[PDB]
Structure 1
């Protein structure tokens, strides 16, 4: 869908969460959808609060 091609820069993530995802080579919404909540928690220095922030951002884009 056009929302799944959105670059993660438009997710308005925190600079910490954004830099951790970008360090994990996650570049598209499809890539992030390829990770589970557990896989998100396995991301180095990604915390529960940052996963909640990502969930809220995804809900912001539906």
Structure 2
């Protein structure tokens, strides 16, 4: 599924659109350390992804 289909918010949508993360398959493949490396990452984004 697309991550946006999970009814996410402004910062997460902008991060997935500018960078190019499209499906939750790559998110479930990527670990928490591999996803928190992004700069200007939001604590709310971390909480919702967790």
Please say whether Structure 1 and Structure 2 have the same fold, judged by a TM-score greater than 0.5: yes
Larger radius of gyration: 1
What does residue 54 of structure 1 align with? 49
Matches within 5 A, 1:25-44: 25-44=20-39
Gaps of 5+ in 2: none
Instruction: Describe the superposition over 1:9-48 as per-residue Cα deviations: whole angstroms up to 9, x where unpaired.
Output: 2111111012113333210010111211111110121233
Q: Does 1:11 align with 2:6?
A: yes
Q: Number of residues paired by the alignment? A: 50
Gaps of 5+ in 1: 1-5, 56-62
Structure 1 stretches of 4+ with a deviation exceeding 3 A read none
Q: Does 1:45 align with 2:43?
A: no
